[PDB]
Each structure stands twice: as C-alpha cells, then as structure tokens.
Amino acid sequence: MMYVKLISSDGHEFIVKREHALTSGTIKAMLSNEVNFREIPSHVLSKVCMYFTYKVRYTNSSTEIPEFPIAPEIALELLMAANFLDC
C-alpha cells in the first residue's frame, strides 16, 4: 500500500495512506512522499490524520455515524489547520 509522511512543526512524523492524505487538496499540491508542516504541531496533525480515517470510513456508509470529537483546547488550532488544508 502507498503511504506518505506528514511531518509536524515539532518533528513528529505521521505515516498515513496516500489516498487518505489526498482528502486535502493542499496536501495533494504539496506532494504533486513527505510533507513538512511548519505551522502545524503534532497535537493538531495527529487529529487531522484521525479525521482522514474517520472520513474515509464513514463517507457513503449506512452504519450510524458518530460525532467527530474535538477537545476545546485544540479546536482553534485545528480550525486554522483545516482552513489551510481545505478539509
């Protein structure tokens, strides 16, 4: 399977399916197999990756959809990230 590496500002290396990372048009542009995110710290990028998994799993599915959880403390940074990444 094809993976790509997404690297946080603090140096955490997140390895995810390419297909998953292409959820983001921004990441697609940055690839077109590693991308560095100078403004996205690991406590945000980890959650971004979890969102990819969530979206791929639950898009076009019949099984009941749970709420995607976001702790108050990270919501503002996650919002900024999602706006940059267009996801």
């Binding site: 399977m1 993976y3 946080s8 603090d10 140096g11 955490h12 290396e13 997140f14 390895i15 995810v16 399916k17 998953h20 710290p41 690991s42 406590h43 980890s46 990756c49 979890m50 969102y51 990819f52 998994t53 969530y54 791929v56 799993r57 639950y58 749970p66 995607f68 959880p69 702790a71 108050p72 403390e73 990270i74 919501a75 503002l76 940074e77």
Partner: protein
C-alpha cells in the same frame, strides 16, 4: 471487523487498520512494508505489555469498538539495533496552549 491503530515509536506514528482476527506477527509484516525492518527486529506493545506474535489483535484487547477510526488505539513499537532491543520510547505529542480567555 476492522480495528484502527496508531503504531508508535519515538517520533514515528503509523495510522493503519487491521482485522481483529489478524495477528501480532502480521502487524509486524505491515510495519515491515512501511519502515523496512523485519519482524524479528520489532517488538510490539500494548501499554507496557510485550505482544506475542501468534496472538490476534482482538485477544490482545484491540477491538473494533475501542480502536475506532476517530480515536485509534496505540500499539507501541521498539527496534533492535545490532544485538539487543532498545527500550520502548514514545515521544508525547505537543501540549495545547491555554484556552484563550474568550473560550472559558
């Protein structure tokens, strides 16, 4: 049933899924394809517990309703350099800042 995992060593985190019926050893084969280290140079952990190769992920507590897409379960990973295995080290993620006043 799919289980959704983060396989973590040092500052490396792999997001992937696997069958509840699949084995620890089979998960090392997955890690091998990604990080290019054979199973015999890997130790996998649930918290502090070393996982046995022949056990299913299910038997080791990774179930579909706890290892969820939006909140995946963590599997610790340690590598053998030369003769002996390093200790299990998982770098924590960064800390969120304080809530801005208007969010309190």
């Amino acid at each position: 049933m799919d289980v959704f995992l983060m396989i973590r060593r040092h500052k490396t985190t792999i997001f992937t899924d696997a069958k509840e019926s699949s084995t620890v050893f089979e998960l090392k084969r997955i890690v091998e394809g990604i990080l290019k280290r054979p199973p015999d140079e890997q130790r996998l952990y649930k918290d502090d517990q070393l996982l046995d190769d022949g056990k299913t992920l299910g038997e080791c507590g990774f179930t579909s309703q706890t290892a969820r897409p939006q909140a995946p379960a963590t599997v610790g990973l340690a590598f053998r350099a030369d003769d002996t295995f390093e200790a299990l080290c998982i770098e924590p993620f960064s800390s969120p800042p304080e809530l801005p006043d208007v969010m309190k």
